[PDB]
Amino acid sequence: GKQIKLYHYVPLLDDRNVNDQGIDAAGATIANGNLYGSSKDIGTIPSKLPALTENGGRVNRVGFTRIQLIGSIKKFGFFYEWTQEAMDFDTDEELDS
């Protein structure tokens, strides 16, 4: 259909992993599906590290995302026309080339 689609699977820790499957140690309403993204700030990762306890259970859930690409094809062209006389009675007998 004159178009081509793709899937670009974003990694987990990339901040492009926008996801609703976000559960922390205690609650499950976390919007940040990825653990901490790539915030890269010492004041953040220890808090967002998946610190599981003695009792396990439904803690630190994560989800993953895919990215769709799109590209389309287009048509182009042009043309020129000449008469026989324009080639015959011309000063230069090489106009064709």
Binding site: I23, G27, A28, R58, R61
Partner: peptide, 11 residues
């Protein structure tokens, strides 16, 4: 209590 269908861990 652990929640099954959706998220989990209601207090």
């Amino acid at each position: 209590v652990a929640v099954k269908h959706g998220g989990g861990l209601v207090v």
